[PDB]
């Protein structure tokens with residue numbers, strides 16, 4: 125089961141609902157599509173990678189790789205992550 | 211082995227995972243379950259390269275090294291119109307502002 | 314409250330740093346005071362002579378970000394079974410995306426320019442609330 129997160133510029137990101145629920149904000153918006161008027165797609169795509177990363181590596185004993193963040197998107201990703209509570 | 215993918219067409223991006231041993235066709239069934247277009251109406255690409263339905267994702271270059279949760283590999287998707295396949299078009303994501311001087 | 318027990322029963326320990334960070338091992342002494350030990354470069358190991366009931370935690374040596382050791386917060390050398398050293402496998406946690414962003418921003422902006430960044434005021438304060446072992450020790454407490 126999937127949900128659709130739409131970026132400020134209209135890109136549609138289709139991710140597993142369980143991955144999207146990493147964000148408590150997204151959980152409330154879903155309780156299915158969500159429109160993010162303030163998160164552009166180059167940020168929202170990284171947020172989606174983060175969900176995948178978080179769900180894959182939470183509770184795993186393997187060595188966990190660093191979640192990589194380009195300096196150029198650090199600030200917007202920070203504000204998106206702050207809003208999304210994740 | 212799980213590989214982590216962004217399946218992309220136009221302004222659509224599907225985040226999903228699949229086994230390295232699964233086939234391009236089985237990925238099309240995944241796409242069909244999500245976007246409701248049957249496999250015969252889909253073409254899947256890595257870069258500009260059309261992918262063979264019977265090939266596994268690993269043989270198509272999707273491996274634990276190249277298709278990571280925090281850095282998924284991109285699969286291009288193109289749909290068939292009326293017996294004619296559209297050209298592969300993937301709209302880029304937006305651009306970040308220029309780096310602040312303070313960074 | 315969070316302190317090493319003075320057992321004086323040796324316990325052989327291997328610190329393996331399975332993280333890309335320079336790791337600062339921290340021993341909580343018998344008064345609960347954190348004592349830094351020599352840093353482990355990323356991916357390196359180090360044999361350590363410690364003691365049963367001693368208390369360790371691990372941080373990025375440059376930034377003091379928290380690290381996990383054997384998937385939890387604190388490492389306590391136990392009995393060496395069949396005389397084999399106990400492993401302290403140090404890993405990155407899954408940081409929240411917010412904290413991970415704070416890490417990258419802090420690592421790119423010297424703290425004298427946090428206010429010169431165009432963000433909400435609450436993020437300005439979050440940037441400045443650098444991770445630090447004393448604060449973490451009160452949290453665990």
Ligand SMILES: CC(C)N1CCN(Cc2ccccc2F)CC1
Pocket residue numbers: 321340361362363364367
């Ligand atoms: C009372 C005396 C025997 N202490 C002094 C403190 N030091 C603790 C220690 C040292 C070196 C590595 C790990 C440790 F945990 C050695 C034990």
